[PDB]
Design a protein around this ligand. Structure first.
Ligand SMILES: OC[C@H]1O[C@H](OC[C@H]2O[C@H](O[C@H]3[C@H](O)[C@@H](O)[C@@H](O[C@H]4[C@H](O)[C@@H](O)[C@@H](OC[C@H]5O[C@H](O[C@H]6[C@H](O)[C@@H](O)[C@@H](O[C@H]7[C@H](O)[C@@H](O)[C@@H](O)O[C@@H]7CO)O[C@@H]6CO)[C@H](O)[C@@H](O)[C@@H]5O)O[C@@H]4CO)O[C@@H]3CO)[C@H](O)[C@@H](O)[C@@H]2O)[C@H](O)[C@@H](O)[C@@H]1O
Ligand SMILES: [Ca+2]
Ligand SMILES: [Cl-]
Length: 875
C-alpha cells in the first residue's frame, strides 16, 4: 500500500480534493496509527483502518484564506471534517481519503492552522537548566539521545513531552556541551510506514563532523567570542547609505587554497582571513581602500558535498597536471576522478542553515567553527569590508527518513519541502524545494537570518533563488533584521542589506504558490535583485544559448566573430537594442526612467522589453538593482570575452574589453557587483559550471603570475558539448595573459572604484534624482554604434533647481567606447563648459586613457578605442 497524495488537509475542518460532483457524495477519511491500511481484495473499500468518517461536501467551496495561501488548489472541491474528529490524533497517522479512488493527504495547511508556534525552539539555557524544544506535530514520539563526545556511545535517552505540537524536555545545566540527536517516530509518506528517525536539531548552532550529532552549545558563552567581539559594532566600516554599496563575490576555499603566504594548516577555511599580511588579505585591503564595501561569501553554513573529516580528502598531483597540454582533457579526468572526495564544493546543498560549515574550521568537533567564523567577520570588518552571506533557503540537499544529510524532512515529513499536486517533492531548485509559504518554514528562515545577524554580526544577505521564496517571507525578514539595534542586540540592523536572485520559473511562476520573490514582485521593496538584462546585453546572448552570440562589449556588428547573426543592418540594430537595455541598467534599471530608444521613440524602462515581453527596467529605486556582468555561475568575465570576441584579437585588446565591462558596472547607478577575479583576469579555462571542478579549475592566484587560462579542457559533464570551441582557444598561446596584464587589470580596476567613490553623482539615492540628473547623449537611429555617453548633472549657477550633492564637481560625463578606434562625440548641449579629464585618469598607469580630451567650442569628447573616459567639471 503506497498511495500518492492528491488531497489536502487545509484547515482543521476542511479537506480539498479535485473530484467530480457525483464522486463527492461518497468521500470518507480513514486513519491508521500503525500505518496498517490496504485496499480490500475486490477493491470496493479500504481495509485495516482504526477509524473511518464520512466527509460531507462543503457546497461553498474553499474559503478566501485557503485560496490565498494555496492558489494552485483554489478550484478544488471542499469537504467538511466533522467536529467529532480528533485532528491532533489523526495527523500522527497514516491517512487516506477514498471514494475506486484512493489517495493520501497533504497536511501543511492543517498543521499551520492548528500548530503554528511562536514560542522557543531549539536549546534554551538558564542559570540552572537547559531545555530542548522541537516542533513535530505529526510525530508519535520524540526522545533525545545524549552522547559524551562526538564519537562515543549513547549515554542516556530522555523522553520529550508534547504540548501544542511542540516536544520539550528540561534538564540540568550539566547538559551543556553534550552531543545529541532526536529519536523521532513519525509516519513517512515515501515509505508508507511509521519510522524511527535519528535527526539533528533544525535550530542547531553547532555540530560534530558532518552534522552527525548536534553540539548542545550555549552560543552566548564568553569563550566563543574573539577578543573585543562585543565592541565590533563600533569598529564596523561606516555605511551612510545602501547607495554606497559595492559587492565582491568570493568563495572561502578559492580565497586561500593556493595562497602560499598562509600557513599550510590554515589554507582553505575561515582561519585564512585572520592572516592580515597574507597576499589574499592584502589584495582585499587594496580593493577596500579603493572603495569596495562588501564581500559576499559563497555558502558557509552546514552543506553537503564536502567531508568535514580532512583525513578523507583527496588531491590531484598538481605537478603532473601542470605538464599536460593546455587543451588536453587529462586534467579534468584527474579532477573528476576525485571530485566527490576532494575539499571542494560551492556549497549550494543545504543541510542545517544555522551552523558554520565544519570543513572550513580547523577542527569540526567543538567550538572552532564558531570562533573562527567570528574571527573571519571581525578580520574583514577591520580591513574596511562588510560581510554578506549567500543564503540558500530555497531547497534542501536531501529528504526522507534516512541519511546523515536529511534533517528537516526526517522530523516533519512533507512539510518543509514543497510538493506537486500528486504529493511528489518539487525539484526545480536542484532538488527538495522548500515551502517558505508554510508558517514554520517561514519562521525558520527568519530565525536563521537573525541568528547570523546577531550571533555572527553578519552585515547582509544574498538570497539564492529568491523567486522560490515567498515575498511575505522576504519582507518579514527585512523588517525583523533592520529593526535590530546595538543597544538590544549588539548590531545596527538599519545597515543590514538584502538582495537576491529573483528568477521566476517552474512551479512558482505566475504567483501559483503565492506572491513569490521574483524580480517584478520585489519592485518597490528596497530589496536588491540581479539585473540579468544588463549582463546579457554587455556580454551577448545568454548563458544557455549559443556561446558565440555577441553583445555590446564582445563585438556585435563592430567586430563580427564569424558566427552568423544576421545581415549588417540586423546586427547594427541588435547592437543598438542592447545599448538601450544597458543604458536603462546604467540609470538604475528603473521602471519609469525615460530613454530616447534606438528608434528615436522615447520609452520608459518598463516599455523596453526582453524577449519574453517583460520589462527591462523593473525597479522603483536604484538600491533594488544589482548590476553585474559576471558571478560564480557560468563563464568568468575573462572567459566569456575570450569566447565571444574575434579569435584574432590580441590578449592586450581583450584586457581592455574586460576593463570596459567592469567599469560599466563600477560607474552605474544602483549597486555594482563584481565576481572575485574580474579585477585580475580570472579564468576557469572556460568552465561553464565550476561548482565541483576542484581547486584546479577555480584557482585564485594572488601572486598574479597566472590567471588559470589554459589548464586543460574543463570537466566533461557540464562542458563537453562546447569543447570544440574551447580547445583551439585554450591551446593558443596568444590568449593567455602574463603577470603584466594581470597587474594592469588590477590597477585600472582600483582606479575605476576610486572614480565611483570620488563623486556622489555616481551613487544617486532615489529614482527622482536619477530621472532629474542622468542623461544619455548618443541615442536614436543615427547613434554612433559602439558608444554610450552618460551625463550626470549637479547643482550649478545661482539658485539652481536641485540640491548640490558634490562639493568638487558640478557635472560628470562618462563615455564608454567599445569601438576598436578613437571616437569623437559632439554634444553641443555640453559645449562651453569646464570639462577636464578626471584626475585619476590624468594620472593613470594606462597611457591610452590619458589621451582623452574635451573641446569647449563644440562640446566634443575625444575618446580612444576600447576605453572608458570620465570627464568632470570642477567647482
Ligand atoms: O547526482 C546526485 C548528486 O546530488 C548532489 O548534487 C546535487 C546537484 O548538484 C549540481 O547542481 C549544482 C549546480 O551545478 C551548481 O551550478 C549550483 O547551482 C546553483 C547556483 O550556484 C545558484 O546561483 C542558483 O543558480 C540558478 C541559475 O541561475 C541563473 O540562471 C538564470 C539566468 O541568469 C536568468 O537570466 C534567467 O534566464 C532565463 C531567461 O530570462 C529567459 O528569457 C529564458 O531564456 O530562460 C532562461 C532560463 O532558462 O533565469 C535563469 C534561471 O531560470 C544562472 O545563470 C544559472 O547558471 C543558474 O543555474 O541555483 C543553482 C541551482 O542550485 O549548485 C547546484 C547544487 O549544488 C548538479 O548540476 C545537479 O544535477 C545535482 O543534482 C551531490 O552533491 C552529488 O555528489 C550527487 O552526485
Ligand atoms: Ca567536490
Ligand atoms: Cl592535446
Amino acid at each position: 500500500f503506497m498511495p500518492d497524495a492528491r488531497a489536502y488537509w487545509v484547515t482543521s475542518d476542511l479537506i480539498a480534493w479535485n473530484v467530480g460532483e457525483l464522486e463527492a457524495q461518497s468521500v470518507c477519511l480513514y486513519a491508521s496509527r500503525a500505518a496498517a491500511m490496504s485496499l480490500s481484495p475486490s477493491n470496493g473499500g479500504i481495509q485495516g483502518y482504526d477509524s473511518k468518517v464520512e466527509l460531507q461536501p462543503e457546497s461553498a467551496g474553499l474559503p478566501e484564506t485557503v485560496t490565498q495561501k494555496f492558489p494552485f488548489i483554489s478550484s478544488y472541491r471542499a469537504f467538511r471534517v466533522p467536529s467529532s474528529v480528533d485532528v491532533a490524533s489523526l495527523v500522527k497517522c497514516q491517512l487516506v481519503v477514498a471514494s475506486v479512488d484512493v489517495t493520501g493527504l497533504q497536511l501543511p495547511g492543517v498543521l499551520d492552522d492548528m500548530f503554528a508556534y511562536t514560542g522557543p525552539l531549539g536549546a534554551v539555557f538558564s542559570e540552572d537548566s537547559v531545555s530542548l524544544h522541537l516542533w513535530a506535530p505529526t510525530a508519535q514520539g520524540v526522545s533525545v539521545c545524549f552522547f559524551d563526545g562526538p564519537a562515543g556511545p549513547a549515554l542516556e535517552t530522555v523522553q520529550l513531552k508534547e504540548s501544542n505540537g511542540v516536544w520539550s524536555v528540561t534538564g540540568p545545566r550539566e547538559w551543556e556541551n553534550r552531543y545529541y540527536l532526536y529519536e523521532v517516530d513519525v509516519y513517512h509518506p515515501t515509505k508508507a510506514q511509521v519510522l524511527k528517525c535519528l535527526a539533528g536539531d533544525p535550530y542547531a548552532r553547532s555540530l560534530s563532523a558532518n552534522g552527525a550529532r548536534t553540539w548542545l552549545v550555549d552560543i552566548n558563552n564568553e569563550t566563543l567570542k574573539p577578543a573585543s567581539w562585543d565592541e565590533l559594532a563600533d569598529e564596523k566600516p561606516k555605511l551612510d547609505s545602501f547607495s554606497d554599496i559595492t559587492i565582491y563575490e568570493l568563495h572561502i576555499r578559492d580565497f586561500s587554497a593556493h595562497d602560499g603566504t598562509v600557513d599550510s594548516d590554515s589554507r582553505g577555511g575561515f582561519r585564512a582571513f585572520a592572516y592580515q599580511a597574507s597576499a589574499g588579505m592584502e589584495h582585499l585591503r587594496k580593493l577596500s581602500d579603493a572603495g569596495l564595501t562588501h564581500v559576499h561569501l559563497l555558502p558557509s553554513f552546514h552543506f553537503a558535498g564536502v567531508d568535514d573529516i580532512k583525513s578523507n580528502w583527496k588531491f590531484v598531483d598538481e605537478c603532473e597536471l601542470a605538464t599536460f597540454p593546455p587543451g588536453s582533457d587529462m586534467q579534468q579526468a584527474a579532477v573528476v576522478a576525485i571530485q566527490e572526495e576532494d575539499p571542494y564544493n560551492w556549497g549550494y546543498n543545504p543541510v542545517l542553515w544555522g551552523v558554520p560549515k565544519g570543513s572550513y574550521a580547523s577542527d569540526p568537533d567543538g567550538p572552532s567553527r564558531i570562533i573562527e567564523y567570528r574571527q573571519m567577520v571581525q578580520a574583514l570588518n577591520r580591513i574596511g569590508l562588510r560581510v554578506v552571506m549567500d543564503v540558500v533557503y530555497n531547497h534542501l540537499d536531501s529528504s526522507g527518513p534516512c541519511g546523515i544529510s536529511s534533517v528537516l524532512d526526517k522530523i516533519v515529513p512533507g512539510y518543509y519541502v514543497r510538493r506537486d499536486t500528486n504529493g511528489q517533492i518539487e525539484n526545480s531548485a536542484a532538488m527538495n524545494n522548500t515551502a517558505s509559504e508554510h508558517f514554520m518554514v517561514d519562521r525558520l528562515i527568519v530565525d536563521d537570518l537573525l541568528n547570523w545577524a546577531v550571533n555572527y554580526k553578519v552585515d547582509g544577505f544574498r538570497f539564492d533563488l529568491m523567486g522560490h521564496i515567498m515575498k511575505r517571507t522576504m519582507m518579514r525578514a527585512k523588517s525583523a533584521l533592520q529593526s535590530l539595534t546595538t543597544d538590544a542586540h549588539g548590531v545596527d540592523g538599519s545597515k543590514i542589506y538584502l538582495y537576491g536572485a529573483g528568477w521566476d520559473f517552474a512551479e512558482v511562476a505566475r504567483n501559483q504558490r503565492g506572491i513569490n520573490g521574483s524580480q517584478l514582485n520585489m519592485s518597490g521593496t528596497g530589496i536588491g535583485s540581479f539585473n540579468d538584462r544588463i549582463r546579457d546585453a554587455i556580454n551577448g546572448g545568454n548563458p544557455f544559448g549559443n556561446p558565440l552570440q555577441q553583445g555590446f562589449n564582445t563585438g556585435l556588428f563592430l567586430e563580427p566573430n564569424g558566427f552568423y547573426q544576421g545581415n549588417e543592418a540586423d546586427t547594427r540594430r541588435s547592437l543598438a537594442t542592447y545599448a538601450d537595455q544597458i543604458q536603462i541598467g546604467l540609470a538604475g534599471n528603473l521602471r519609469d526612467y525615460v530613454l530616447i530608444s534606438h528608434t528615436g521613440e522615447a520609452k520608459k524602462g518598463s516599455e523596453i522589453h526582453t524577449f519574453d515581453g517583460l520589462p527591462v527596467g523593473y525597479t522603483a529605486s536604484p538600491i533594488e538593482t544589482i548590476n553585474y556582468v559576471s558571478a560564480h555561475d557560468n563563464e568568468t568575465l575573462f572567459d566569456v570575452i575570450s569566447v565571444k570576441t574575434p579569435m584574432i584579437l590580441s590578449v592586450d585588446e581583450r584586457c581592455r574589453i574586460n576593463h570596459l565591462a567592469s567599469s560599466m558596472m563600477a560607474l552605474s547607478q544602483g549597486i555594482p557587483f563584481f565576481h572575485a577575479g574580474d579585477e585580475i583576469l580570472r579564468s576557469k579555462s572556460i568552465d561553464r559550471d565550476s561548482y565541483n571542478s576542484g581547486d584546479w579549475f577555480n584557482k585564485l592566484d594572488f601572486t598574479y603570475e597566472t590567471n588559470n587560462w589554459g589548464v586543460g579542457l574543463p570537466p566533461s559533464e557540464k562542458n563537453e558539448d562546447n569543447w570544440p570551441l574551447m580547445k583551439p582557444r585554450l591551446e593558443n598561446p596568444s590568449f593567455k595573459p602574463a603577470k603584466g596584464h594581470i597587474l594592469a587589470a588590477l590597477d585600472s580596476f582600483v582606479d575605476i572604484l576610486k572614480i565611483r567613490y570620488s563623486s556622489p553623482l555616481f551613487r544617486l539615492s532615489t529614482a527622482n534624482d536619477i530621472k532629474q540628473r542622468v542623461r544619455f547623449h548618443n541615442t536614436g537611429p543615427s547613434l554612433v554604434p559602439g558608444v554610450i555617453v552618460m551625463g550626470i548633472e549637479d547643482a550649478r549657477g545661482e539658485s539652481p533647481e536641485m540640491a548640490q550633492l558634490d562639493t568638487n564637481f558640478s557635472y560628470v560625463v562618462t563615455v564608454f567606447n567599445v569601438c576598436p578606434h578613437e571616437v569623437s562625440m559632439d554634444i553641443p548641449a555640453l559645449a562651453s563648459m569646464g570639462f577636464e579629464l578626471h584626475p585619476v585618469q590624468v594620472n593613470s598607469s594606462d597611457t591610452l586613457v590619458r589621451k582623452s580630451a574635451y573641446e569647449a567650442a563644440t562640446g566634443r569628447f575625444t575618446v580612444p578605442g576600447r576605453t572608458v573616459s570620465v570627464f568632470v567639471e570642477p567647482r
